[PDB]
């Protein structure tokens, strides 16, 4: 419970959305609940543009957008499933963009929670049955199976 993960923190996104669109769509539940500052998204964007968070993993591309922890009010996590792949720049400096389709936006300010959530993300994104299921499932199912791992 060190982290707030609500039901409306899980949502699907249409094909006509850009990188900023994803960030804004995912940050707003965090904003409404007052989990982060009210211009969280602008910060996340600027942080992504300098330190890209695209992860080249098979078979479902992941990105994990965040910002400085000094913008978080309480720990929270917002998930987004893309209908079509959207390009995130690769977190490792590789020329080729990650075809992201699952996005874990992190609004964490507690260090001991940050490390734990990252370790978890690393574990989950190497489970191809899980990652693939996240596409076909609905919000609740997604919420359910992710919560079952928290």
């Amino acid at each position, epitope marked *: 419970q060190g982290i707030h993960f609500r039901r409306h923190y899980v949502r699907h996104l249409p094909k006509e959305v850009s990188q900023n669109d994803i960030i804004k769509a995912l940050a707003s539940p965090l904003i409404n609940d007052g989990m982060v500052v009210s211009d969280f998204a602008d910060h996340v964007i600027t942080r992504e543009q300098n330190f890209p968070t695209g992860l080249p993993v098979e078979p479902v591309g992941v990105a994990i957008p965040h910002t400085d*922890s*000094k913008y978080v009010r309480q720990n929270a996590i917002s998930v987004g499933i893309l209908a079509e792949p959207v390009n995130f720049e690769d977190a490792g400096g590789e020329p080729d963009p990650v075809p992201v389709r699952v996005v874990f936006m992190l609004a964490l*300010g*507690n260090w*001991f929670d940050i*490390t*734990n959530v*990252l*370790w978890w993300i*690393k574990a989950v994104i190497q489970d191809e049955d899980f990652m693939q299921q996240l596409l076909v499932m609905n919000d609740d199912e997604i919420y359910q199976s992710i919560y079952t791992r928290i």
Partner: antibody
Amino acid sequence: EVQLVESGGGLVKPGGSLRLSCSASGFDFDNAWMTWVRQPPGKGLEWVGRITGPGEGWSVDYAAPVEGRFTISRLNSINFLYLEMNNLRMEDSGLYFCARTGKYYDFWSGYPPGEEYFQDWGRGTLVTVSS
Amino acid sequence: YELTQETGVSVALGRTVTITCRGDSLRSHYASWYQKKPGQAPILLFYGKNNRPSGVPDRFSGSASGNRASLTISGAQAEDDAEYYCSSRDKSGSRLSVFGGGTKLTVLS
């Protein structure tokens, strides 16, 4: 341009109390994790404890031989770090350092809670616990 | 001192020397490295998997394998004659930290 100056060390009888201070400058003390480290005489560096920042709720962690006796605190308004020591023993004596604490975690190989490192140190203040 | 270091290691001036640090927690956590001379504050030399703080000479490097961690001074100088400590978690997954016993590096010639 970081500057840390420990103070408050001195001679104290076993069982006694003592309060070490640390004036911090040159950086953002407020959101900075701070750590106390000591060096007993003729021995090496020893980690005493560390206070975290705002996101962590100013949580503090302590070394086992010191847990329960010592208290780490901060007053961010004048960038001071403190170390409240009670019920001292001979082995509590040494040179006490304060140091700016950085957090490190590598994503692909890391294991929570990653690691803490000590980028800036002060000169230390001498604690002597003798009868 | 669950992190074990060599008591003393010598190195000819100009030559290359590696000090190591071993412990079970190193299988999970990196170490960071400090130089200390008596009467002076310690100096952070190296941390992480590949991180050296600015202002620290290039002769210093850290590395890691299995349950051990090691600092390598390439082309040891007179100034390098000091104490070196490593620091890391005391156990795997620990919020606490710990220091090795410390290696005295005397520079020869």
